[PDB]
Amino acid sequence: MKHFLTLRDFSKEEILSLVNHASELKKEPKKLLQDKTLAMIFEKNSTRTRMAFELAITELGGKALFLSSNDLQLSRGEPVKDTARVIGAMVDFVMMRVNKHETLLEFARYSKAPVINALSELYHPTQVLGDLFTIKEWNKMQNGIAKVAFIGDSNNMCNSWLITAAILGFEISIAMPKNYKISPEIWEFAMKQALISGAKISLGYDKFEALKDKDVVITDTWVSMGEEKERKIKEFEGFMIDEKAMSVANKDAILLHCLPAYRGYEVSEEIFEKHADVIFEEARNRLYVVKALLCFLDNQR
Amino acid sequence: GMKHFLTLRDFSKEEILSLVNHASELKKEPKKLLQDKTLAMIFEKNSTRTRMAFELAITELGGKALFLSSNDLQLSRGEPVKDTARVIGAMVDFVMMRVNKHETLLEFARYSKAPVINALSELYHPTQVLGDLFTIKEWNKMQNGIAKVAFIGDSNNMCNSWLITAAILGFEISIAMPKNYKISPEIWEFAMKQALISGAKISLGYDKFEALKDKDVVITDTWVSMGEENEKERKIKEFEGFMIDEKAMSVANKDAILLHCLPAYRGYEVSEEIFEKHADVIFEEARNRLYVVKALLCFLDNQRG
Amino acid sequence: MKHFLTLRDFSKEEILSLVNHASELKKEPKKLLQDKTLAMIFEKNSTRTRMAFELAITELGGKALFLSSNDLQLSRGEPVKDTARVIGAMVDFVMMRVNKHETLLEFARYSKAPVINALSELYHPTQVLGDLFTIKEWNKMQNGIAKVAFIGDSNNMCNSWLITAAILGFEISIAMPKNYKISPEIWEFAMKQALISGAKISLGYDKFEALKDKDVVITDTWVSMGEENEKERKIKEFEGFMIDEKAMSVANKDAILLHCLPAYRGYEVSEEIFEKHADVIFEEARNRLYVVKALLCFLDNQR
Numbered sequence: 075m076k077h078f079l080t081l082r083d084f085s086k087e088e089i090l091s092l093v094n095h096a097s098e099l100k101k102e103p104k105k106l107l108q109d110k111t112l113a114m115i116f117e118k119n120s121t122r123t124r125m126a127f128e129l130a131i132t133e134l135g136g137k138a139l140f141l142s143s144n145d146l147q148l149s150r151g152e153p154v155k156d157t158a159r160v161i162g163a164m165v166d167f168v169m170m171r172v173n174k175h176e177t178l179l180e181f182a183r184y185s186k187a188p189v190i191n192a193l194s195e196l197y198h199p200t201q202v203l204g205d206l207f208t209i210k211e212w213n214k215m216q217n218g219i220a221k222v223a224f225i226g227d228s229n230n231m232c233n234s235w236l237i238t239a240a241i242l243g244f245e246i247s248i249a250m251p252k253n254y255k256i257s258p259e260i261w262e263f264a265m266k267q268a269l270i271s272g273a274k275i276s277l278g279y280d281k282f283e284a285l286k287d288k289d290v291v292i293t294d295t296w297v298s299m300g301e302e303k304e305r306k307i308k309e310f311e312g313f314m315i316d317e318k319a320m321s322v323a324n325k326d327a328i329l330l331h332c333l334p335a336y337r338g339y340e341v342s343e344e345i346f347e348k349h350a351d352v353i354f355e356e357a358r359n360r361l362y363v364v365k366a367l368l369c370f371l372d373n374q375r
Numbered sequence: 376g377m378k379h380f381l382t383l384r385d386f387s388k389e390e391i392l393s394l395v396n397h398a399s400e401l402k403k404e405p406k407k408l409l410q411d412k413t414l415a416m417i418f419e420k421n422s423t424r425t426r427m428a429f430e431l432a433i434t435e436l437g438g439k440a441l442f443l444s445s446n447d448l449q450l451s452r453g454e455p456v457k458d459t460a461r462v463i464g465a466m467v468d469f470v471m472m473r474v475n476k477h478e479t480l481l482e483f484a485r486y487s488k489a490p491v492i493n494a495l496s497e498l499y500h501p502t503q504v505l506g507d508l509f510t511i512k513e514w515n516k517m518q519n520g521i522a523k524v525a526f527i528g529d530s531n532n533m534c535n536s537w538l539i540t541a542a543i544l545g546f547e548i549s550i551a552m553p554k555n556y557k558i559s560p561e562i563w564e565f566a567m568k569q570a571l572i573s574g575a576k577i578s579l580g581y582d583k584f585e586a587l588k589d590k591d592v593v594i595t596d597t598w599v600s601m602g603e604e605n606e607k608e609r610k611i612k613e614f615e616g617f618m619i620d621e622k623a624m625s626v627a628n629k630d631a632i633l634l635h636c637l638p639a640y641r642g643y644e645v646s647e648e649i650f651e652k653h654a655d656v657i658f659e660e661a662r663n664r665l666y667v668v669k670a671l672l673c674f675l676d677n678q679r680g
Numbered sequence: 681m682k683h684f685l686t687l688r689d690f691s692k693e694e695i696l697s698l699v700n701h702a703s704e705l706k707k708e709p710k711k712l713l714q715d716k717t718l719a720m721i722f723e724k725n726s727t728r729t730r731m732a733f734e735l736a737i738t739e740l741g742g743k744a745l746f747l748s749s750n751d752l753q754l755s756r757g758e759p760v761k762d763t764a765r766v767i768g769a770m771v772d773f774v775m776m777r778v779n780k781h782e783t784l785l786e787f788a789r790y791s792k793a794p795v796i797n798a799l800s801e802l803y804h805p806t807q808v809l810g811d812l813f814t815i816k817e818w819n820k821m822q823n824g825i826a827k828v829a830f831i832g833d834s835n836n837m838c839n840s841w842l843i844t845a846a847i848l849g850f851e852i853s854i855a856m857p858k859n860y861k862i863s864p865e866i867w868e869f870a871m872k873q874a875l876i877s878g879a880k881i882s883l884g885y886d887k888f889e890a891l892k893d894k895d896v897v898i899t900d901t902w903v904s905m906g907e908e909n910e911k912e913r914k915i916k917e918f919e920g921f922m923i924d925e926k927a928m929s930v931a932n933k934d935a936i937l938l939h940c941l942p943a944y945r946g947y948e949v950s951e952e953i954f955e956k957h958a959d960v961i962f963e964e965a966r967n968r969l970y971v972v973k974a975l976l977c978f979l980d981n982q983r
Contacts, residue, residue, distance in 0.1 A: 121459075145725050163966055427766070
C-alpha cells in the first residue's frame with residue numbers, strides 16, 4: 075500500500091499521469107469517490123490547503139473531516155501511533171499538515187489509510203504537482219521538458235522542485251544565498267535521477283544566473299512559519315523578484331508563487347500584480363491535482 | 376453585472392418581498408435547488424446562530440458549507456483581503472462573511488468571482504432583517520403590505536437595516552433611542568429619499584412610549600453592541616427608560632409581537648416576563664433565518680451576469 | 681420523547697437491542713436516516729468521539745454540524761434554555777459532550793430534538809455501549825452474562841459500567857483505592873437493579889480480588905479531565921493499581937483488556953500489556969461507530 079509523502083516515491087510516468095488526470099477532471103468532473111472519507115489533520119492551519127482538499131474529496135462524491143490544531147493536539151497528549159490506529163482505521167484517506175516530517179512517517183507507519191503530505195518541513199509535493207499542472211496549462215512545457223528557475227530558501231519547496239525536476243527531466247536552476255545549503259541526501263537522489271531522465275540541474279547563489287534562459291520562475295516567502303527574522307531578510311538582499319529580474323528570463327515567462335506573498339520582499343507589488351492571473355490560477359489548480367492524487371491512492375491499496 | 380448581498384439598500388421593494396415569498400414556499404415545500412453548490416463561510420467573530428442558518432441553508436438546498444473560522448482565517452492580519460478573495464472567491468459558489476468592518480466585505484466583493492453575503496457588519500445586518508420580515512408576515516402583522524413597526528434600541532447595525540428596509544418597503548416605522556444618540560447621516564439621508572418613493576412614514580425620537588403608539592411589531596436588541604463591549608457600563612445607564620417590559624408592550628397595539636435577534640439580556644433591553652411571554656414568536660424568528668438565507672442563496676445563484 | 685443521557689433510563693432489552701442493531705449495521709450498512717441532521721456540541725474537545733458521531737450520522741445518510749468550544753460558549757453567554765430552543769428546533773438530534781451533567785438535563789428539558797450524552801462527569805454511556813459491542817464480538821459473552829472487572833477511579837466510566845452490569849445481569853467486580861467512594865445514589869440504583877437481573881456486583885480496594893475469574897478487564901486513566909489541578913496526589917494513591925502482565929495473569933486465560941483511551945503507559949497500564957491487547961483496544965475504539973448508529977436510529981423511532 076502506497077502513501078503520498080513525497081514525489082520521490084513516484085515515477086516520471088506516475089507523476090505525469092496525475093497531471094493528465096487532473097486535467098481530465100478539470101475538464102469533465104466526475105464523482106469517482108462516492109461516499110469516501112478524508113480526515114484532514116492540521117498542526118498548523120492553512121486555509122488555502124484546506125480548501126483544496128476539502129473541495130477535492132467533496133466534488134469527487136466524498137466527505138471531509140477537518141480536525142484542527144485546537145481539536146487535535148498531536149504528540150502533546152496521546153502518542154501518534156495511537157491516533158493513527160484509530161483515525162487511520164475509520165476513514166479512507168488521511169491528509170496531514172505537519173510541523174515535522176517524522177510525524178507523518180510515524181502516522182503512516184500505523185495508518186491503515188493512505189496518508190497524504192499536505193506540507194512538511196522537508197517536502198511540499200502537492201504544491202509542486204499544482205505548479206506543474208499550471209506550467210502545462212500555460213503551455214510552458216515545450217518538448218515534455220520545462221526550463222525552470224527556483225529562487226528562495228533551501229526549504230521544503232526547493233527540495234520538492236529539485237526532486238521533481240530530476241524525475242521529470244526538467245532543466246532547473248536553483249538560487250539561494252551563499253551561506254544556505256541543500257540536504258546532501260536529497261541532492262544525491264536527484265543526481266541519480268537526472269542521469270536516468272536527462273535533467274539539467276544547477277545550484278547557485280546568483281539570482282540572475284539562475285534566471286537566464288528560463289520560461290518559469292518560481293519563488294516563495296523567505297520568513298517561513300514557525301521560523302520567525304530581521305537578520306534573515308538582510309541575507310536575502312539581492313533576491314527579490316522584480317521587473318529587472320523577470321527581464322533576465324525569457325520573454326513571456328510566468329511567475330509562480332505558492333503564497334502568501336509579501337510584497338516588497340520576495341516579490342515586488344508591480345511584478346506580482348503583473349502575474350496575478352497565473353499566480354491565482356496556480357492557487358486554485360491545487361484542487362484538480364489533489365483530486366487526481368486521491369483517485370490514484372484509492373486504486374493503490 | 377453580478378450582484379452581491381451586502382445590504383438591503385441595493386434591492387427593490389419587489390426584490391425583498393419576493394425573497395420573503397420564496398422563503399415561505401421553501402418552508403412549506405423544501406427543494407434541493409442548489410445541488411453540489413458550495414458556500415464558504417468566513418467568520419471574523421463567531422456566531423453559532425448564524426452559522427447554523429447558513430450551514431443548514433446550503434445543506435438542505437443540496438450543497439456543502441465550508442466553515443473557515445477566526446483561528447483558521449486571519450483576515451487583514453496576515454495576507455491582504457484581495458488575495459484571499461482571489462483564491463476563495465474563485466473556488467466556491469458563494470461566500471458568506473461575518474466581519475468586524477464593512478469595508479472588508481466591500482474589498483472582498485470587489486475581488487470575488489463569487490457573490491459575497493453580509494452575515495453581519497458594523498453597519499448592516501440584512502439577513503436578520505429578512506428573517507424578521509418573514510416572521511412578521513407569518514404572524515399576520517402585515518396588513519396591506521405595510522407594517523406598523525417600532526424599533527427600540529441603539530443606533531447599531533440592526534437599526535440601520537430596519538430603517539432602510541422600512542424605507543424601501545413603505546412601512547411605518549418609529550425609532551426610539553437615547554437623546555445623545557444619532558443615526559449616521561448618510562444612512563438617514565438614503566432613508567429619507569426612499570420614503571418619498573415608497574410612502575414610508577419614518578419618525579425618530581428619544582421617547583420609548585411615543586415610538587410604541589399604534590404599533591403591531593416591537594423590535595429591540597442588545598444595547599452593548601458586539602465589539603463595543605469595552606464601553607458597556609456607561610451605555611447601560613444611558614438606556615435607563617428603554618427596556619421593553621409589560622407596561623411598554625401595553626402601549627402598543629393589542630396582540631403586538633415582540634422581536635429580538637438574540638441573544639437577549641433579561642433585565643436590560645427586555646424583561647424576563649415579557650421575553651418569555653413572546654418565546655413562541657422570538658424563537659420562530661430565530662429559526663426563520665434558515666428559510667430566508669435559502670431564498671437569498673437561490674436568488675444570488677440566478678443573478679451571476 | 682426519549683433522550684439518551686444514561687443507560688439508567690433503559691431496559692436490559694433495550695440495551696441489548698441497540699448492540700444487536702449495531703451489529704446488523706456493521707454487517708450490512710444501510711442509510712436509514714436520509715437527510716437527517718446532528719448537531720454536535722462540545723464543551724471540551726474529543727476527536728475520537730467526534731469521529732464516531734460524525735461518521736455515524738454521515739453513513740446513515742445525514743449531516744453533522746460540529747459546534748466547538750470556541751464556537752459555542754454554553755452557560756457563559758446566553759442561557760442554555762435559549763440555546764436549546766434554537767438549536768434543538770433546527771436539527772434532528774443533538775449530541776453533547778459536557779463538563780457538567782446538569783447542562784445536558786437543562787438542554788434536554790428545552791430541546792425539541794433528542795439529546796445524546798457523549799460524555800459527562802457522571803456518565804459515559806456511549807462508551808459502555810461500545811465496550812459491550814466489543815465484548816460480544818470477542819465471544820466473551822457466555823450465556824448472555826459477562827464476567828467483568830473494572831479497575832480505576834470512581835469516575836463516569838465506573839458509574840456507567842456499574843449501572844450497565846446491574847441492568848444486564850453481568851458479574852462485575854470493581855476495584856479502586858481505599859479512600860475512594862462511589863456516589864451513594866448511583867450505588868443504590870445498582871443494588872436495586874441487581875436484585876431484578878441477578879447481577880453479581882462487588883466493590884473492593886484489591887486489584888487482584890477484582891480480577892479473579894474474569895474474562896474482561898476494563899481500566900481507565902486515573903487523572904480524569906478537569907481534575908488535573910490535583911494530579912500529583914492521585915498518582916500516589918493508585919500505587920498498586922496498574923494493569924500489568926502479573927495482573928492479567930490473575931484473570932482467566934485469554935481475557936481481553938479494554939481501555940477507553942487515551943492511555944498513559946506506565947500508569948494505569950503497562951506498555952507491554954497495552955500493546956499485547958492493541959487489536960481489541962483499537963477495535964473497541966472503532967466500534968463506537970456502530971453503536972452510535974444504532975442509538976441514532978433508535979432515538980429517531982422514539983419521538
